[PDB]
PDB file of C-alpha atoms in Angstrom:
ATOM      1  CA  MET W   1      -8.811 -14.409  -6.186  1.00 14.01           C
ATOM      2  CA  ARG W   2      -6.621 -11.126  -4.640  1.00 12.88           C
ATOM      3  CA  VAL W   3      -4.402  -8.339  -5.461  1.00 13.76           C
ATOM      4  CA  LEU W   4      -1.672  -6.516  -3.361  1.00 17.81           C
ATOM      5  CA  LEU W   5      -0.254  -3.334  -4.557  1.00 21.28           C
ATOM      6  CA  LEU W   6       3.422  -2.137  -3.694  1.00 19.93           C
ATOM      7  CA  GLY W   7       5.480   0.732  -4.401  1.00 20.54           C
ATOM      8  CA  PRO W   8       8.211   3.788  -3.587  1.00 17.67           C
ATOM      9  CA  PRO W   9       6.860   7.301  -2.408  1.00 17.16           C
ATOM     10  CA  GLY W  10       5.354   9.051  -6.705  1.00 16.77           C
ATOM     11  CA  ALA W  11       1.591   9.315  -7.027  1.00 14.59           C
ATOM     12  CA  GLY W  12       1.169   6.657  -9.324  1.00 10.68           C
ATOM     13  CA  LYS W  13      -1.042   3.695  -6.876  1.00 12.82           C
ATOM     14  CA  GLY W  14      -4.042   4.503  -5.561  1.00 14.19           C
ATOM     15  CA  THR W  15      -6.298   5.597  -9.391  1.00 11.47           C
ATOM     16  CA  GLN W  16      -5.662   1.864 -10.599  1.00  9.13           C
ATOM     17  CA  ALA W  17      -6.183   0.749  -7.921  1.00 12.10           C
ATOM     18  CA  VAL W  18      -9.478   2.538  -6.961  1.00  9.77           C
ATOM     19  CA  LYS W  19     -10.280   1.456 -11.272  1.00 12.03           C
ATOM     20  CA  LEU W  20      -8.920  -2.070 -10.920  1.00 16.64           C
ATOM     21  CA  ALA W  21     -12.143  -1.823  -7.803  1.00 13.11           C
ATOM     22  CA  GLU W  22     -15.007  -0.995 -10.504  1.00 11.89           C
ATOM     23  CA  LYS W  23     -13.674  -3.971 -12.429  1.00 13.18           C
ATOM     24  CA  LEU W  24     -13.518  -6.812 -10.376  1.00 11.96           C
ATOM     25  CA  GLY W  25     -16.056  -6.580  -7.432  1.00 10.80           C
ATOM     26  CA  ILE W  26     -13.512  -5.549  -5.115  1.00 13.63           C
ATOM     27  CA  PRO W  27     -12.890  -3.887  -1.453  1.00 15.28           C
ATOM     28  CA  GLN W  28      -9.689  -1.054  -2.598  1.00 12.84           C
ATOM     29  CA  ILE W  29      -8.677  -0.724   0.556  1.00 12.52           C
ATOM     30  CA  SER W  30      -5.895   2.402   1.438  1.00  9.89           C
ATOM     31  CA  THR W  31      -4.675   2.275   4.778  1.00  8.57           C
ATOM     32  CA  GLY W  32      -4.619   5.764   5.116  1.00  9.21           C
ATOM     33  CA  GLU W  33      -7.727   6.596   4.782  1.00  6.50           C
ATOM     34  CA  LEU W  34      -9.641   4.663   6.524  1.00  7.45           C
ATOM     35  CA  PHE W  35      -7.137   4.808   9.860  1.00  6.02           C
ATOM     36  CA  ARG W  36      -7.760   9.546   8.322  1.00  7.53           C
ATOM     37  CA  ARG W  37     -11.879   8.903   9.315  1.00  8.70           C
ATOM     38  CA  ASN W  38     -11.167   8.162  12.577  1.00  4.34           C
ATOM     39  CA  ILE W  39      -8.143  10.668  13.419  1.00  2.87           C
ATOM     40  CA  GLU W  40     -11.459  13.062  12.402  1.00  3.81           C
ATOM     41  CA  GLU W  41     -13.582  10.748  14.452  1.00  2.00           C
ATOM     42  CA  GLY W  42     -11.537  10.289  17.835  1.00  2.00           C
ATOM     43  CA  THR W  43      -9.769   6.141  18.191  1.00  2.00           C
ATOM     44  CA  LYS W  44      -6.665   7.460  19.473  1.00  2.00           C
ATOM     45  CA  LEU W  45      -4.882   3.798  17.256  1.00  2.00           C
ATOM     46  CA  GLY W  46      -6.253   5.902  15.016  1.00  2.00           C
ATOM     47  CA  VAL W  47      -3.877   8.936  14.848  1.00  2.00           C
ATOM     48  CA  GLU W  48      -0.843   7.343  16.433  1.00  2.00           C
ATOM     49  CA  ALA W  49      -1.074   3.946  13.887  1.00  2.00           C
ATOM     50  CA  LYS W  50      -1.183   6.212  10.850  1.00  2.00           C
ATOM     51  CA  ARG W  51       1.036   8.506  11.293  1.00  2.00           C
ATOM     52  CA  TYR W  52       3.731   5.996  11.944  1.00  2.00           C
ATOM     53  CA  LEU W  53       2.576   3.510   9.139  1.00  2.00           C
ATOM     54  CA  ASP W  54       3.063   7.103   6.997  1.00  2.00           C
ATOM     55  CA  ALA W  55       6.417   8.681   8.817  1.00  2.00           C
ATOM     56  CA  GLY W  56       7.630   6.208  10.376  1.00  2.00           C
ATOM     57  CA  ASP W  57       8.335   4.693  13.965  1.00  2.00           C
ATOM     58  CA  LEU W  58       7.574   1.851  14.715  1.00  2.00           C
ATOM     59  CA  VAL W  59       3.653   0.422  14.598  1.00  2.00           C
ATOM     60  CA  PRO W  60       2.053  -2.438  16.609  1.00  2.00           C
ATOM     61  CA  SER W  61       0.667  -5.131  13.403  1.00  2.00           C
ATOM     62  CA  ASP W  62      -1.656  -7.161  15.010  1.00  2.00           C
ATOM     63  CA  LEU W  63      -4.526  -3.752  15.384  1.00  2.00           C
ATOM     64  CA  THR W  64      -3.729  -3.265  11.908  1.00  2.00           C
ATOM     65  CA  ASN W  65      -5.278  -6.511  10.778  1.00  2.00           C
ATOM     66  CA  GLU W  66      -7.978  -5.860  12.816  1.00  2.00           C
ATOM     67  CA  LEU W  67      -9.213  -3.017  10.925  1.00  2.00           C
ATOM     68  CA  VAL W  68      -7.551  -4.813   7.402  1.00  2.00           C
ATOM     69  CA  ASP W  69     -10.883  -7.682   8.471  1.00  2.00           C
ATOM     70  CA  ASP W  70     -13.347  -4.648   9.777  1.00  2.00           C
ATOM     71  CA  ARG W  71     -13.269  -4.048   5.995  1.00  2.00           C
ATOM     72  CA  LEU W  72     -13.228  -7.402   4.661  1.00  2.00           C
ATOM     73  CA  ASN W  73     -16.470  -7.500   6.248  1.00  2.00           C
ATOM     74  CA  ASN W  74     -15.149 -11.524   5.521  1.00  2.00           C
ATOM     75  CA  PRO W  75     -18.216 -13.379   3.449  1.00  2.00           C
ATOM     76  CA  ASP W  76     -18.344 -10.778   0.734  1.00  2.00           C
ATOM     77  CA  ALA W  77     -13.851 -10.188   1.154  1.00  2.00           C
ATOM     78  CA  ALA W  78     -12.706 -14.240   1.828  1.00  2.00           C
ATOM     79  CA  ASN W  79     -12.272 -14.944  -2.592  1.00  2.00           C
ATOM     80  CA  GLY W  80     -11.460 -11.211  -3.481  1.00  2.00           C
ATOM     81  CA  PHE W  81      -9.951  -7.601  -2.398  1.00  2.00           C
ATOM     82  CA  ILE W  82      -7.583  -5.515  -3.189  1.00  2.00           C
ATOM     83  CA  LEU W  83      -5.104  -4.091  -0.668  1.00  2.00           C
ATOM     84  CA  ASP W  84      -2.706  -0.368  -1.246  1.00  2.00           C
ATOM     85  CA  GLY W  85       0.692   0.432   0.482  1.00  2.00           C
ATOM     86  CA  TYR W  86       0.344  -1.729   3.711  1.00  2.00           C
ATOM     87  CA  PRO W  87       4.079  -3.894   2.845  1.00  2.00           C
ATOM     88  CA  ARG W  88       6.173  -0.793   3.344  1.00  2.00           C
ATOM     89  CA  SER W  89       9.031  -2.535   5.328  1.00  2.00           C
ATOM     90  CA  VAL W  90       9.960  -6.766   6.250  1.00  2.00           C
ATOM     91  CA  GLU W  91       9.076  -6.409   9.484  1.00  2.00           C
ATOM     92  CA  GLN W  92       5.046  -5.007   9.555  1.00  2.00           C
ATOM     93  CA  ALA W  93       4.863  -6.915   6.058  1.00  2.00           C
ATOM     94  CA  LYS W  94       5.917 -10.202   7.052  1.00  2.00           C
ATOM     95  CA  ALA W  95       2.462 -10.188   9.069  1.00  2.00           C
ATOM     96  CA  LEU W  96       0.264 -10.470   6.324  1.00  2.00           C
ATOM     97  CA  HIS W  97       2.699 -12.896   4.388  1.00  2.00           C
ATOM     98  CA  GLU W  98       1.991 -15.341   8.274  1.00  2.00           C
ATOM     99  CA  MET W  99      -1.660 -14.927   6.966  1.00  2.00           C
ATOM    100  CA  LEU W 100      -1.764 -15.280   3.014  1.00  2.00           C
ATOM    101  CA  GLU W 101       0.203 -18.490   3.420  1.00  2.00           C
ATOM    102  CA  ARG W 102      -0.293 -19.301   6.878  1.00  2.00           C
ATOM    103  CA  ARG W 103      -4.291 -17.986   7.033  1.00  2.00           C
ATOM    104  CA  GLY W 104      -4.597 -19.227   3.714  1.00  2.00           C
ATOM    105  CA  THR W 105      -6.111 -16.851   1.485  1.00  2.00           C
ATOM    106  CA  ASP W 106      -5.722 -16.906  -2.211  1.00  2.00           C
ATOM    107  CA  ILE W 107      -2.356 -15.717  -4.097  1.00  2.00           C
ATOM    108  CA  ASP W 108      -2.693 -13.619  -7.440  1.00  2.00           C
ATOM    109  CA  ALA W 109      -1.103 -10.753  -7.543  1.00  2.00           C
ATOM    110  CA  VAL W 110       1.559  -8.638  -5.684  1.00  2.00           C
ATOM    111  CA  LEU W 111       1.484  -5.872  -7.724  1.00  2.00           C
ATOM    112  CA  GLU W 112       5.043  -3.230  -7.647  1.00  2.00           C
ATOM    113  CA  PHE W 113       4.921   0.205  -9.292  1.00  2.00           C
ATOM    114  CA  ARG W 114       7.526   1.379 -11.329  1.00  2.00           C
ATOM    115  CA  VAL W 115       6.963   5.191 -11.546  1.00  2.00           C
ATOM    116  CA  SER W 116       9.238   8.344 -12.348  1.00  2.00           C
ATOM    117  CA  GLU W 117      10.860  10.985 -10.058  1.00  2.00           C
ATOM    118  CA  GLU W 118       7.767  13.138 -11.736  1.00  2.00           C
ATOM    119  CA  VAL W 119       5.248  11.585 -10.350  1.00  2.00           C
ATOM    120  CA  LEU W 120       6.555  13.458  -6.613  1.00  2.00           C
ATOM    121  CA  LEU W 121       7.101  16.268  -8.283  1.00  2.00           C
ATOM    122  CA  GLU W 122       3.303  16.660  -8.812  1.00  2.00           C
ATOM    123  CA  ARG W 123       3.108  14.869  -5.252  1.00  2.00           C
ATOM    124  CA  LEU W 124       3.585  18.920  -4.458  1.00  2.00           C
ATOM    125  CA  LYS W 125       6.239  20.322  -6.821  1.00  2.00           C
ATOM    126  CA  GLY W 126       3.240  21.933  -8.432  1.00  2.00           C
ATOM    127  CA  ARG W 127       1.132  23.039  -5.327  1.00  2.00           C
ATOM    128  CA  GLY W 128      -0.581  21.384  -2.164  1.00  2.00           C
ATOM    129  CA  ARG W 129       1.394  21.930   1.150  1.00  2.00           C
ATOM    130  CA  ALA W 130       3.706  24.008   3.790  1.00  2.00           C
ATOM    131  CA  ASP W 131       6.139  21.415   4.698  1.00  2.00           C
ATOM    132  CA  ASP W 132       4.508  19.727   6.593  1.00  2.00           C
ATOM    133  CA  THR W 133       7.329  16.847   5.213  1.00  2.00           C
ATOM    134  CA  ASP W 134      10.344  17.687   4.440  1.00  2.00           C
ATOM    135  CA  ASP W 135      11.073  15.999   8.366  1.00  2.00           C
ATOM    136  CA  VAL W 136       8.449  13.484   7.838  1.00  2.00           C
ATOM    137  CA  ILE W 137      10.164  12.829   4.337  1.00  2.00           C
ATOM    138  CA  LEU W 138      13.554  12.361   6.444  1.00  2.00           C
ATOM    139  CA  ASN W 139      12.240   9.437   8.555  1.00  2.00           C
ATOM    140  CA  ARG W 140      10.567   7.496   5.749  1.00  2.00           C
ATOM    141  CA  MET W 141      13.806   7.475   4.051  1.00  2.00           C
ATOM    142  CA  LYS W 142      15.953   5.865   7.345  1.00  2.00           C
ATOM    143  CA  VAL W 143      11.991   3.523   6.959  1.00  2.00           C
ATOM    144  CA  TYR W 144      14.139   3.011   3.675  1.00  2.00           C
ATOM    145  CA  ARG W 145      17.091   2.194   4.406  1.00  2.00           C
ATOM    146  CA  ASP W 146      17.158  -0.191   6.671  1.00  2.00           C
ATOM    147  CA  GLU W 147      14.185  -2.945   4.396  1.00  2.00           C
ATOM    148  CA  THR W 148      14.727  -1.970   0.670  1.00  2.00           C
ATOM    149  CA  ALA W 149      17.093  -4.785  -0.493  1.00  2.00           C
ATOM    150  CA  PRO W 150      15.457  -7.490   1.088  1.00  2.00           C
ATOM    151  CA  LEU W 151      11.508  -6.073   0.520  1.00  2.00           C
ATOM    152  CA  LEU W 152      12.729  -6.791  -2.980  1.00  2.00           C
ATOM    153  CA  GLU W 153      14.059 -10.565  -3.278  1.00  2.00           C
ATOM    154  CA  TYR W 154      11.167 -11.849  -1.237  1.00  2.00           C
ATOM    155  CA  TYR W 155       8.981  -9.494  -2.629  1.00  2.00           C
ATOM    156  CA  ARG W 156      11.187 -10.217  -6.806  1.00  2.00           C
ATOM    157  CA  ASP W 157      10.558 -14.043  -6.202  1.00  2.00           C
ATOM    158  CA  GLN W 158       6.283 -13.303  -5.730  1.00  2.00           C
ATOM    159  CA  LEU W 159       5.834 -10.111  -7.664  1.00  2.00           C
ATOM    160  CA  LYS W 160       3.930  -9.029 -11.244  1.00  2.00           C
ATOM    161  CA  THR W 161       5.305  -5.255 -11.943  1.00  2.00           C
ATOM    162  CA  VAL W 162       2.912  -2.120 -13.489  1.00  2.00           C
ATOM    163  CA  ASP W 163       4.995   0.900 -15.508  1.00  2.00           C
ATOM    164  CA  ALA W 164       3.138   3.971 -14.054  1.00  2.00           C
ATOM    165  CA  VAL W 165       3.827   7.304 -15.315  1.00  2.00           C
ATOM    166  CA  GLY W 166       3.004  10.532 -17.010  1.00  2.00           C
ATOM    167  CA  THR W 167      -0.217   8.763 -18.626  1.00  2.00           C
ATOM    168  CA  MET W 168      -3.443   7.704 -16.730  1.00  2.00           C
ATOM    169  CA  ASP W 169      -5.797   5.361 -19.957  1.00  2.00           C
ATOM    170  CA  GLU W 170      -1.697   4.270 -20.876  1.00  2.00           C
ATOM    171  CA  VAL W 171      -0.608   2.781 -17.239  1.00  2.00           C
ATOM    172  CA  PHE W 172      -4.314   1.508 -16.864  1.00  2.00           C
ATOM    173  CA  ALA W 173      -3.326  -0.814 -19.941  1.00  2.00           C
ATOM    174  CA  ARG W 174      -0.599  -2.305 -18.078  1.00  2.00           C
ATOM    175  CA  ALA W 175      -2.555  -2.539 -15.548  1.00  2.00           C
ATOM    176  CA  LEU W 176      -5.032  -5.420 -17.095  1.00  2.00           C
ATOM    177  CA  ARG W 177      -1.350  -6.938 -19.588  1.00  2.00           C
ATOM    178  CA  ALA W 178      -0.057  -8.083 -15.928  1.00  2.00           C
ATOM    179  CA  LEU W 179      -3.937  -8.751 -13.838  1.00  2.00           C
ATOM    180  CA  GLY W 180      -7.152  -9.021 -15.299  1.00  2.00           C
ATOM    181  CA  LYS W 181      -5.793 -10.210 -19.466  1.00  2.00           C
TER     182      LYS W 181
END
């Protein structure tokens, strides 16, 4: 069995994705982490395709599903994998649905997180940067407007939800209540 981790901007996501990978025995692949490591190494598809996937200009499908398959290492990830933050937009995300149903991988849970504005307010309303954002938040709000209504029809027929606000150990109790038991 297998999981994909969905939700708008708002801190709560990756903390119960790494904790649920410790319970099940899986590769948790977050799409910013392996790509940021290729920015320090010096690839050239690391830096444009990671900024694009986070800032909001157009990123190609085949290289992004090639780096996901490199951290499958698949004779170990054919019956499991936890992805976080890859279906942001119906146009990149329909290539991953063409490979789960058309390629023919396990469908357990698309796990979408219901999270409040307060998580972004940790999400540096507390102390973390110096307006690299504002302009990156405006281009991300452009990719929010093109897709969110058609995206919630496709994934609203497919998904399971988690509530995720404030608390650490209570929010993990709701994440297994949706997926593990």
